[PDB]
Design a protein around this ligand. Structure first.
Ligand SMILES: [Ca+2]
Ligand SMILES: [Cl-]
Ligand SMILES: [Mn+2]
Ligand SMILES: [Mn+2]
Lengths: 366, 371
């Protein structure tokens, strides 16, 4: 992922303009090869027209240039691009929201699975490790970077996510389908065992744990669904054909004709179609947005950082359920115990922007 | 006949025990008194649930009231050694088993854990495992066994061992309550049975590693006394509560090391036993709180016991001083059972003697200093 929200915190004079100077995850890094290809074909065709072609053939070539320029439609391709890219962006954001995150699970576990002893600590750590393991399994199924990090289940075992005995139980299961759901079933069994053993004190807490487990598992299933069910291939081919047809039309129809013929709208030759190159940037980059977001778990610069999320979730969940279990500072009175109003101070840098009348409603200025 | 306290309405107490106690936590400090066989306890309030034994403060008591000191400097100190969940008060309340120290911070005379822990740390790599079969007899407040006819005897022994029915098992309610109370507390209780003597019972503690054997058995004894106090009966660990053709109570100790548990560990079992063969008198003195006089009434060689004056070992020998189980002989590995220790033995003394003789190759009539 390429984060630039710090740069665009305000609508400045040169806000979006300086974003064109970035390289990592930029339009240039995605297009420059197609840009050089389009420029190469355009320059080769222009050179052939200027030198190689006969005078007789040049009249036919320029008539074909006029014909190809008449059918260069830039408006209709904008519709198919807008709709297709909007669908791809919707899928991309929903895919990000489906990342297996264990924050809800860690909060429930640390608040419901009890015991300062070795067994309670084993319960909490193993409950969160099961969710981490199912996250790792689904992500290595869907993400190329995680797969290269965990090429085999042996890599998962050496990483500490799954144990030797859990590995034997995992491989002995007779199923031809992806087994990312297995640690979730293990989580359900372990939660039921903890409730039976009294580690979970109340019936509500067990229900809350299974509700939060099914939310986590549904996110894993949703990542599998997005991975399996692509954007329909026919629609992707339609947008690609529209864009490539328009650019093939622009390659010939926008060729610089000899001004000596005096054809209208073609009485100039700048030997570089800079406005056609700007249109190429526009439409080719608009397609490149979808081409980068269509599978957001690849190795694009703007693709999701799945390995970082795995590491963060594992470390934070272990910290929260093990070192932070029932480890609280003693209850004491805050700065505003005796104060009628509870208001924090402002720094010298924020006071002169703040201290303004508080909004009470639209109807109170009558 | 049960005690006057047992006749107080238990319903009432429960009603008070059902009150939510709030943020304060009760800790019951348990220690061994000056007889080396009696347990004492008292309770303090803590601000919060202790996460480990390290968070428990040291405490103190008057040693002149526990047969443990005399004169001016009778204040003794309690140092927490092992923590357990309180089965009488429930979570988050704790049972705190403590070592006893004199006013000058020297170990108390009945503090055998202090030396026992040092010996266990010396052989930690060999990982010694222990198990103890604690036999006990339930008694009425009149000093007669629980359930026996008034000033009389039940039928002869034969049907009571592992018996079921109103005429076979006496005071099983206490046994069930104790078993559960120990499981809740985190005591390593391995099982129970009705013994050959009616109103006599047994619970197994183990396997426990090193110093954990003494902590688990002593706290298991405390819970039994406290559970029996609720029912208004007495648990006695007297090695021979009733004279005649009525079984004694022993504390059979199972011992194994990492070498003995491994394949072909029988050779190490036999080496340990032949070392024990040469120190029978040293172990008899250690296996009894008063030097072996109590166990003289039990070790008569008649009622599935051995002779106190003679040492013997064998495979599947119930009458021997040391027994190698038949399965251990067949599998050529496992443990051996020391059947000598009395029911009122100190487990710290018993475990320390086994390690000194079998693992540290100690000889003579006195324990080695610093080794
Ligand atoms: Ca991508
Ligand atoms: Cl008390
Ligand atoms: Mn027995
Ligand atoms: Mn036995």
């Amino acid at each position: 992922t390429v984060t630039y929200t710090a740069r665009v915190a305000k609508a400045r004079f040169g806000g979006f303009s300086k974003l064109l100077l970035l390289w990592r995850g930029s339009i240039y890094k995605l297009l420059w090869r197609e840009l050089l290809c389009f420029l190469g074909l355009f320059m080769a065709l222009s050179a052939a027209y200027r030198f190689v072609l006969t005078e007789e053939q040049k009249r036919y070539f320029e008539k074909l240039v006029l014909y190809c320029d008449r059918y260069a439609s830039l408006i209709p391709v904008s519709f198919v691009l807008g709709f297709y890219v909007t669908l791809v962006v919707h899928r991309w954001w929903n895919q990000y929201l489906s990342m297996p995150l264990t924050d809800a699970l860690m909060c429930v576990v640390v608040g419901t699975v009890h015991g300062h002893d070795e067994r309670g600590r084993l319960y909490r750590r193993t409950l969160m490790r099961y969710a981490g393991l199912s996250g790792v399994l689904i992500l290595r199924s869907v993400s190329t970077a995680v797969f290269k990090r965990f090429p085999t289940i042996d890599h998962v075992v050496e990483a500490g996510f799954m144990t030797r005995e859990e590995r034997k139980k995992f491989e002995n299961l007779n199923s031809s389908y992806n087994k990312y759901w297995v640690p979730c079933v293990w989580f359900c069994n372990l939660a039921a065992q903890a409730r039976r053993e009294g580690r979970i004190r109340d019936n509500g807490a067990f229900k809350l744990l299974l509700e939060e487990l099914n939310v986590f598992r549904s996110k894993c299933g949703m990542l599998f669904h997005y991975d399996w069910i692509s954007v329909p291939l026919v629609y992707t081919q339609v947008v690609t054909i529209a864009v490539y047809s328009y650019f093939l039309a622009c390659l010939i129809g926008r060729q610089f004709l000899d001004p000596a013929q005096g054809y209208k709208d073609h009485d100039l030759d700048l030997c570089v179609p800079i406005f056609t190159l700007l249109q190429f940037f526009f439409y080719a980059g608009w397609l490149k947005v979808a081409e980068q977001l269509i599978n957001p778990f690849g190795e694009d610069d703007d693709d999701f950082e799945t390995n970082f999320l795995i590491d963060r979730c594992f470390q934070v969940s272990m910290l929260a359920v093990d070192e932070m279990y029932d480890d609280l500072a003693m209850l004491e009175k805050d700065l505003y115990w005796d104060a009628a109003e509870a208001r924090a101070p402002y720094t010298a840098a924020t006071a002169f922007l703040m201290q303004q009348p508080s909004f009470q409603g639209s109807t109170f200025d009558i | 006949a049960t005690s006057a306290s047992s006749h107080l309405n238990k319903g009432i107490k429960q009603v008070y025990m059902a009150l939510p106690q709030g943020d304060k936590v009760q800790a019951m400090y348990i220690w061994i008194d000056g007889t080396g066989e009696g347990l004492r306890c008292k309770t303090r309030t803590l601000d919060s649930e202790p996460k480990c034994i390290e968070e428990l403060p040291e405490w103190n008591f008057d040693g002149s009231s526990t047969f443990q000191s005399e004169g001016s400097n009778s204040d003794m100190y309690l140092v927490p050694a092992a923590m357990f969940r309180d089965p009488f008060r429930k979570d988050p309340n704790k049972l705190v088993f403590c070592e006893v120290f004199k006013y000058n911070r020297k170990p108390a005379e009945t503090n055998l854990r202090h030396t026992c822990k040092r010996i266990m740390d010396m052989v930690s790599n060999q990982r010694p495992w222990f198990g103890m079969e604690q036999e006990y007899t339930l008694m009425g407040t009149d000093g007669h066994p629980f359930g026996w006819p008034s000033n009389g005897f039940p039928g002869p022994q034969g049907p009571y061992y592992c018996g079921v029915g109103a005429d076979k098992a006496y005071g099983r309610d206490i046994v069930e309550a104790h078993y559960r109370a120990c499981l809740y507390a985190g005591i390593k209780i391995g099982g129970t049975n009705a013994e050959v003597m009616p109103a006599q019972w047994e619970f197994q503690i183990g396997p426990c590693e090193g110093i954990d054997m003494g902590d688990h058995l002593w706290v298991a004894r405390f819970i039994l006394h406290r559970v029996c106090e609720d029912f208004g009966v007495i648990a006695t660990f007297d090695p021979k509560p009733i004279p005649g053709n009525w079984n004694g109570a022993g504390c059979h100790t199972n011992f194994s090391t990492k070498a003995m548990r491994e394949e072909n560990g029988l050779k190490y079992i036999e080496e340990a036993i032949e070392k024990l063969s040469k120190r029978h008198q040293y172990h008899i003195r250690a296996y009894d709180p008063k030097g072996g006089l109590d166990n003289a009434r039990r070790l008569t060689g008649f009622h599935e016991t051995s002779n106190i004056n003679d040492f013997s070992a064998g495979v599947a020998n119930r009458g021997a001083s040391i027994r190698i189980p038949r399965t251990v002989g067949q599998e050529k590995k496992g443990y051996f059972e020391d059947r000598r220790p009395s029911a009122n033995c100190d487990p710290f003394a018993v475990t320390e003697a086994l390690i000194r003789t079998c693992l540290l190759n100690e000889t003579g009539d006195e324990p080695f200093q610093y080794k």
